[PDB]
Amino acid sequence: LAMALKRINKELSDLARDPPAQCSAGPVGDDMFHWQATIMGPNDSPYQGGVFFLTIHFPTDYPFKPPKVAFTTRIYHPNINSNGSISLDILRSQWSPALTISKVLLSICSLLCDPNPDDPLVPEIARIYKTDRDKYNRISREWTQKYAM
Amino acid sequence: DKIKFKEPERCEYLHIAKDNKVHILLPIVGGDEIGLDNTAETTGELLTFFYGKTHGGTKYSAEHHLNEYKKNLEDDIKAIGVQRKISPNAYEDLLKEKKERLEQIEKYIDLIKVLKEKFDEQREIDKLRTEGIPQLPSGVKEVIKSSENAFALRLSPDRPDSFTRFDDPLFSLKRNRSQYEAGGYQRATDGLGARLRSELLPPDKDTPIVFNKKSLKDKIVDSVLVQLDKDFNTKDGDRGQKFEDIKKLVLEEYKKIDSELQVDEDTYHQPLNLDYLENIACTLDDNSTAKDWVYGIIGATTEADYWPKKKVSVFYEKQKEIKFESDTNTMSIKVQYLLAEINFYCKTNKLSDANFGEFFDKEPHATEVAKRVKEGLVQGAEIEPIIYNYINSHHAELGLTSELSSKQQEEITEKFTQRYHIIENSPHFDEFFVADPDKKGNIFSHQGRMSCHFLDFFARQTKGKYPLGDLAGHQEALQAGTSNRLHHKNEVVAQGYEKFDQFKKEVVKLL
């Protein structure tokens, strides 16, 4: 079990020294397996300005499994749900040790900036993304302002 | 009319041969294959046999039983007589057969009186009732001395009772000094019991000895570390190489356990080495120990859920650990009693005349065994084979011309278990009288008593002097005979009148 506890401490000392401008993550308490992260919506999106929290729950055999990453903060997006659960290949099938928890965050950034409706975790919103962006945007913007500011 | 006969189908101490010979059996102690009486309480069956209930109550003496058995026969022969007036040829043999028994029952009665009246000058019999802690009569002792199928076994419990009563123990260990001996309780500093104590005695009340502190991988990891040198590193010389040397050693162990296992690829199929884990998986670094290296390799090279995926020896019995001093004693007795059984098997099967315990008391062996049982306990290993392996490694010192087949070991573990269970609540574990009734021997099982032939005792207790007369064939008679387990009912008397009623009442069961 120290194998992962050595790995994570790496990834934290990485993110500490050189953070991403639009992301941030770290543990709470002396526990190093439960993290908290924040993405801030990108400046070419309805999610702009708003600040979204996530929880990263690492496994005991990390990096040989993916982490459980999910949004604590409400977001009206096609690929994310009320549970909080993201759908993102790299958390499910395409996971590798090479992959940092950062690159997950980065990928969650792009997901917001460049949302994919063909892998719909929430078909209701997916209907609306594909038939009326103005409606999608106005809402996904209103939700950003209510729940993420 | 089928007379209501008074001859009992069961009488204390009374077997009857196929051929209508009455055998009286002198009880040494309660039991079948392992004595239920020991130490101070040992002579109790003899006491009962010879004087019945003069101390405490509710058990009759032999003379008493025989004397009523005699009377019952006297009454039956009349009734048969009375019947033969009306039906001349009634009960022809049964009448012969009963007179036959009567005559011998009378001779056994004589012999018992004779024994008490003319041969107890030393008072060996009489002391059974006067003394507080009687000795076995010498006659009994001399029977037991000569037995080929029955042996006393003597252990070393933490608080020994010095009042042991089985003089020539086949197996024996150095004991502590008893509270009941001059100078009082004193633990020995040497001997197998001493080492078992020190080794299975946990350090404090707060920290026990738990029975599975080894994952299969934990075991594997240990296996690999013993290989490296006293002085071995992760941080000197060529490091990539060392990791190669250790991959090898890991690889080795993967084979003993499983075929599918491999060390070339991480679960992802990428080249696994020190660069790879120190840099990409990032599971290792400068401050890793060699132990870490191993786990890392394991961790990289296997899914985690497929380690937990990889009948109950008498040593693990709802116990997960050794918490208390009492727990440690018990465990030690168990190891000992096992050594004892091994010795009984070896002796009774003519493999070895030795006292095994005499060897396990000795400087290297005592210590190793203790340590080795302790180690097995923390791993969850079967303890039995550890002991079998040691004996098999050393079998020439232990008087054996060869090792013990898996067969032999399976059998030993079997009886060990049967018997231990049978005695596990004994108030004292100081000594046990064990017999194998499937062998040529002077000791018999009958009615839950381990028993000499009354007449075998009589011969020896009188040193030949008084003559056996008609009974002089009987001992050797019971010896020819397919077994030494003697049926608790005399089929020749009962005659299967009872089997006919076992039936009649199953025909009632249909309505």
Numbering used by the authors:
A (entry chain B): -1 to 147
B (entry chain A): 6 to 315, 323 to 523
Article excerpt on this structure:
The Legionella effector protein SidC and its paralog SdcA have been shown to be required for the recruitment of ER proteins and ubiquitin signals to the LCV during an infection. Our previous work has further shown that the SidC and SdcA are bona fide Ub E3 ligases. To gain insight into the molecular basis of the ubiquitination reaction catalyzed by SidC/SdcA, we determined crystal structures of two SidC/SdcA complexes: a binary complex of the SNL domain of SdcA with the E2 UbcH5C and a ternary complex of the SNL domain of SidC with the E2 UbcH7 covalently linked to ubiquitin (UbcH7~Ub).
The crystals diffracted to 3.0 Å and the structure of the binary complex was solved using molecular replacement using our previously determined SidC (a.a.1–542) structure as the search model. This structural feature indicates that a drastic conformational rearrangement is required for the INS lobe to bring the two catalytic cysteines within attacking distance for efficient Ub transfer between the E2 and the E3. A comparison of the SdcA-UbcH5C interface with that observed in the SidC-UbcH7~Ub complex reveals common structural determinants for E2 recognition. In the SdcA-UbcH5C complex, residues K4 and K63 of UbcH5C form salt bridges with SdcA residues D287 and D305. Moreover, the R5 side chain of UbcH5C H-bonds with the main chain carbonyl group of A286 of SdcA.
